Symmetry: C3
Amino acid sequence: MINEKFPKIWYGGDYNPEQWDKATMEEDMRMFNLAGIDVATVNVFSWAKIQRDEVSYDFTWLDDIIERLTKENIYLCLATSTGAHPAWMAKKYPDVLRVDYEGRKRKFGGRHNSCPNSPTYRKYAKILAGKLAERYKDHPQIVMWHVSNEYGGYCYCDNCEKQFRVWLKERYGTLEALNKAWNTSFWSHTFYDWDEIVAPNALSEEWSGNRTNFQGISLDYRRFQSDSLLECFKMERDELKRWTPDIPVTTNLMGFYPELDYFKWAKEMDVVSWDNYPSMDTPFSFTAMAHNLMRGLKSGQPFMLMEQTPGVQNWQPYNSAKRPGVMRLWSYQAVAHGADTVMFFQLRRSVGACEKYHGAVIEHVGHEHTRVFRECAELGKELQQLGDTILDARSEAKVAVMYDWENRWALELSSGPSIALNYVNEVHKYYDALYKQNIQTDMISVEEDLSKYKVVIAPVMYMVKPGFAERVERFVAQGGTFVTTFFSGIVNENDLVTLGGYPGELRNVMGIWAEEIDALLPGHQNEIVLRQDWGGLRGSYSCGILCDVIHAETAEVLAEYGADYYKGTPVLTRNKFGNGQSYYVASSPDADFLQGLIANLCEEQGVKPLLNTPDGVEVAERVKNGTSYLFVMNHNAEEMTFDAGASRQRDLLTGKTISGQATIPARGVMILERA
Amino acid sequence: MINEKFPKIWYGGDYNPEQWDKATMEEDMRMFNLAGIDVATVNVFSWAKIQRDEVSYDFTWLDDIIERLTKENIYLCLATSTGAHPAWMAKKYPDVLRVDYEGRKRKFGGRHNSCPNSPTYRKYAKILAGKLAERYKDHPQIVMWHVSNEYGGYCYCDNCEKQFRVWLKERYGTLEALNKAWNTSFWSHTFYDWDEIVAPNALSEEWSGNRTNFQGISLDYRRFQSDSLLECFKMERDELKRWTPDIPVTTNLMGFYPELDYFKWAKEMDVVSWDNYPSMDTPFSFTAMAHNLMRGLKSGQPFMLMEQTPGVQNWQPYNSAKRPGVMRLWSYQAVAHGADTVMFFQLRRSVGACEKYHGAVIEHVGHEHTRVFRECAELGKELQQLGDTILDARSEAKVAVMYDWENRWALELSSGPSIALNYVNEVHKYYDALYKQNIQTDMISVEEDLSKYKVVIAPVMYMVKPGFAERVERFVAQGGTFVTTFFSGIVNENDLVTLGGYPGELRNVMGIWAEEIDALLPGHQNEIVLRQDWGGLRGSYSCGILCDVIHAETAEVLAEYGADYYKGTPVLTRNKFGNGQSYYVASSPDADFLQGLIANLCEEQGVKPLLNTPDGVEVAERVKNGTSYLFVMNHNAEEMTFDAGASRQRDLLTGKTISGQATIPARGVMILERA
Amino acid sequence: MINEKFPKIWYGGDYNPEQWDKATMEEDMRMFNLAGIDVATVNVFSWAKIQRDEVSYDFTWLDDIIERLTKENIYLCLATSTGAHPAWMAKKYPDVLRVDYEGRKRKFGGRHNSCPNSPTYRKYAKILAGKLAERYKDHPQIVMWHVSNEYGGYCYCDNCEKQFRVWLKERYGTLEALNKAWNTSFWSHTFYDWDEIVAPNALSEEWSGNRTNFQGISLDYRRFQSDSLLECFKMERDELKRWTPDIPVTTNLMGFYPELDYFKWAKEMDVVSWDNYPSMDTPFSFTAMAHNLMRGLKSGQPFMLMEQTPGVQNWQPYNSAKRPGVMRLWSYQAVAHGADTVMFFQLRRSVGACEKYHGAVIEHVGHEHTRVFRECAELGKELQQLGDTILDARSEAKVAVMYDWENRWALELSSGPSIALNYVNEVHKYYDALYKQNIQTDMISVEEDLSKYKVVIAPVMYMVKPGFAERVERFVAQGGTFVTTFFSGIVNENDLVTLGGYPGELRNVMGIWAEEIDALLPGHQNEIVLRQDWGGLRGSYSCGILCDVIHAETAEVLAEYGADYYKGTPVLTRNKFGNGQSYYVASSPDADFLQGLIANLCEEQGVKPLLNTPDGVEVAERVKNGTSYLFVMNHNAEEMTFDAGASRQRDLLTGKTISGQATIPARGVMILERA
Ligand SMILES: [Zn+2]
Ligand SMILES: [Zn+2]
Ligand SMILES: [Zn+2]
């Protein structure tokens, strides 16, 4: 379990009574009891309240809050408050403030924006975390540490620049090695001294947020910034554990957030927690893919849903209300994919600055006779009833899909071959296909152990890191199947091209040679024409975005282009390789083709759907011992019917036995317990 | 009259002989005479010409201009020249230059951009104003002072930041009060010293022009900037009044310009003057609303049209020629809404820099045989003919619609609930409905006395200021009808939410409780469904943008939503309150629904249309003594006919007597004199 | 010839073996012989490799490259390496870095971005040029000097600012003359000292690229910046010519690149060279016009095609592969319009940074068995077989269209009359009309000798320079036809309006007076209605963007507007003037009208198509001695057939005799040699 002393799916969220008074806190306790709320995330943004100058610390108000919540038997997710530095500190110690992408020195404002290489910031953040741990070391209600808050953003100040050079010295050892990695002979970029090197932003190598002259520099700086933030986190963590070695430590991540390499972060965290905030056009399968990734970060370990709105958001263009049931629906979607907590931002609405129109359990009227409140209490009852049932359950997926931040950085920094190529979109195209068929799958790192899987899919694996090619070769020869695509195997860890023919280190296992690649204008398409019927693939489908023009060397050709100067050349190939097979997909296909391909690939490895269901009804499974929990989630706004199978099983949410034809209400959820 | 010694609608405008020579001035005099031009606004932009260093003043060139115009008996609107500082001053005294929203120190260039807290600017602008007044104190031709020119724009420099803290001291008195007002417990923003507070711009709290982390700070900064600029105007005003206490002082405003609180500015001005420059998609009823607002800034006092182009604009994307008659049409529209002058920018085209392709009465050919000159001359004759007939005439509207700058600021900084909410558009939707039925209306401040009205409409009255609620409870209690909408009564003067349930202080009088609001995606609607036929309202209408979910408490329900999860809940309510009635409109309805709603509200109070006319034929009324003047303006490109009523009346522009059916030419104007 | 010792069309391009090693060079040499490559442009971006500090120069690596190429008898276009300064130089001498348009001091990065008024840059660029020239002065393989690389971009630094003041001193002599030229009495802009004048960028007079308060200042600053960069070129040129007085010097221009007055630049270069890079929506007639302009820069002298991709680009949004045959097609199109070289960027793909996905002859596989390579080898063989046949051949067009950078700057800076006015587009509309009918034309300076022409077309000649009016009066009177358009003859060289009536200095020769101009909203149109049938002009055509409202004075009206308030007024006039005729075109016509007008005008002067061909089949002629070479180029994806004429002639590319009907393959090229 996340914490043995708290044996259920935690229910609660961010709580900020220091924005109120003791009277309202009494109302909070009353209503939290009605809602089934038993965890509070406190002290996230009270650094200034605590520390008014470099020498004074007042924890008396916090003692009160903690003592009051303990009376109620509410557990504490205790934050270190380092998510936003005080105004006095920004004023006296400007080294704490970031210089931005546009080259500008910031003044005090906002949050999440301390320079991670700031001596002042590091000094005081470490001391604050240490004092909190020391003061509350012996307290029984603290069940989790919450370090800072949503780390992110880049800094380009002088301190980061001098520290970038050190990081470079440690990484490459010499200027010969550095100049080679960065290919500095290009555009007379030869460096003869480390101080000649600068941070890449609007002043130097970059423009428009994602464009650069020097991908090598831009890539490394992102590694460097991610590492620097990670060091701040590690620093607070170590200091916490000095005083409370037995209390878990987390920080709250942002899913597919692009700026941080979360695979590297998660190795440093006792458990992953994250903040799920969907856009109004975010596909339900996308947020599934994100919970999945969060699971994946520690190779299947259940994570905390640290934040989600219980109602409306504030920062979307059009902050629509969450329709009845949806709050519940989306909470159980998180649990289905590995969450062992569902926690909100936030418990009581602020009054406030920019978050006053962000949803909360208790809102502006200040009472419980509210739709949003009702729905929350309802979820709270259920979660109380589930108890420890699902806790620690894991995915036993036989299909994996690979994602990587460094690959993503190189791709997004690349120029070009096409701005229409979006890495996360292509990755999602494959995951979605799996999602619609209810094929249980894991999002994994390129580094993951491949032996649990029968199918490993790696969309646009543009960057191939040391050991990767050999791991997939070994995995395929042993009998696995590997899928990859156009613009894969192009470069190494430094974004230098692997010479001698794409896909380079994967050339042999894919059994094809990609000669050149064609980028299509928006709205232009080519067609995938099957050689002959093959499983659920028949006739023609369309494809777009990019078209690799390849040569089958060892692989069998299964489909070929139907149009353009490369008509009649392969677009889908299969290479037998030891006991396994590899498929190369040379274009970006429509959903029907991927539906077919995925079905074929799973059938070939004997992997079956969890269940067959109508479109919109998602199924995912977690397993505990030899017990299987099928989450069936109806995203449709109408009652729905599906075949739930004949075996004996019960819906954990209703207690009722289920067998055969079953219906599931609109926006409904069932948790099928079975062997 | 604006000035007794000048007893007609003033005609002329901005005039810049100092760009030319004496020879061209003789032609100028000749042509002004042809066009019936009798007023010139001079010396707007010659500070550097007057003052070449900190010690030298040359007024002789200005003496000759004033003397030459005097011989012609042309009246002088004399500007102070402070609307653009001299280059030598920017170079020697950089404190005069602004720091922009991006945090950059500006260099010399442009205009209207002096730092309002510059000691140098204030010093010299005050001396200049004083020297001018003292020099021309005994001149008979000067009928108006034109202070500076179009004050506007924000400054984020060091001096403003320091003055901002002082303004905060004067306003809140203590850090305790400021900390509460700004809700600084959020994001650890507690200030322990005033010096820790900074200007909110791209370096601190804000981004992309209208977004902010802390709207309380951003709201206050805009107040402070508006006051700061206002002080500069008051400074010059007082200096002018020392020497010429009997010459009126104005400064030229920009209508619905968002950055300045003109209601507060207007108290300090002897007469409002404004510059009307419509966009190519500006609806004619909007510019009517703008003129209307200009009249309302001083509670109905007539104003000056200080600027409008006689022909093309220069800064619109597409500067279309003003079709024949349109110039006249639009000048009379201004008069129709309270303009007692009609003035142009400018009398002769510059040659020039950025305004060489802005229209003028005298243009690049340098003669009067021009489409634009002929149209200016025609109007000139009519204004001579009208004499004092219309001067001082007032609006006697019984319908008022409220608009407020602080409300606006708070709304446009808010996040969100929807970027599709535009404060001014919502206001205009109500105005347009009255405009279309020729219901004589007043644009009014939230502070205006309500006693003279029967219908008060306050769209999106998000911010509710001290004394407002009482003021309106009393207006409804004693028989008035008050109309407000979704997202009203949410916050107070500091943008802090008023707790306990929307619409807060308006809850009592509105007799409803708004539980939650729903932002619709663009192109989505809900529907307004009437319980039963009510007056002009019948069946279903569409509504969109935002849908408020409300509970009738004291109010009764006249219509309910026709779709979505809040289908069948109130969207329109009527509350009997004392002798009067308040209507709550929970969404943003289409033009048809508002037409119905307006008619019913007017009928209910006994207010009738001025006149019934075809679409695009505008009718507005100004009353003088007991005499009524009906301005009738045909925006249509073809002849239109209407029934003018049976009472014996003459068109002042023709002398003809009108009764019953009457035709108006394309772009035509009539002014009907009636008792 | 470009260089007499190398008597064929040069084949090769940018070559960068310093990114590689001696061994890969051996492979370069083998493949270059296969491809028929005989010229390499070396040393473009190796400043830092040559010069590690302010005192050290290493040329040995370059010696090695030059020696190896000589063995293979490959000729050298030697660059000076000044296109990108070293990182140590940026670090130690920051005066080398630019200040950008937003006012920021840049840091080391990118290229083409040395401050042209940098003492350090000039000191070291000169020395480097000189050392290169002195070292290789006696070398037999050097056939061209390639100064720097793609000069461009503006600097707003302190040094440029102080030198701008000096350049103004030299140009105007007195503040009196400067204030007048800039019309500084506008907006109190009077300068009393040169140091009060600052550069026009985001901090002062300008915003968002092309908007400005003071076009005079903005216009001169671009002249100054163009001159500054030109001085850097001249400085290197002069140093090179000190040591090798008889080796040609060039620098690679960028065609219709807006920031530099290439007509001024070309007088300083021995031969023009340029870099042809189309957008995916660049019309084939546009790239033709660009080549044509490059020819026009030195009045018909053949130029060097210095760069073009042999395959894909890297900086286009969607970098599509060049379809089979297209590389060759576009290469011959360059030759048709005056290229006496065809060279690529680049010979071997970089590996790399931002250019690794830019095409090359030798690509990432590293061998010649590639579609792209085969196509390059094929072209190279053709070029070896052509020999010196076509060298020095020139255009004998009788139609010219004028283009001007200062005119372009003034039009792009103007506000407004319309942002839908795009000068280069209007220019292309005329050129395209000619290109579609295969009318041989020259793009020319406004300063070119008009004697050689029968039709001269000057679309939007908004700025009219000293001597221009007189030169075209003489041209028309002696028998030429002259065409200009709406919005011409408006200003002088200082962007000051020529008073008295548009089109000012052109008013006499055009025989019309343009009273006013009307900007149309996008999508809006008028119609051109012919008075009677006139040659290929019949009935009614559509027109848009701007409609000039004019009066015929001496000219007769061939066509009038068919709509709006100026319906019935002239839109197309003809003025008989001496033995010639001038046509005024008062609006922007559709392509049908322009087809008709062009045919009419050519017929009127005895000029006929080179050949009638189906659409997309382009024809251009170069003449050498008594022999005419007709380039026929089939832009269509399909075979095409046309009448090649009766005269006895052969295709240079096939050796075959062509007479009467001939068919051209898709993407095909024929070069007909005739009398
Ligand atoms: Zn930093
Ligand atoms: Zn300021
Ligand atoms: Zn410079």
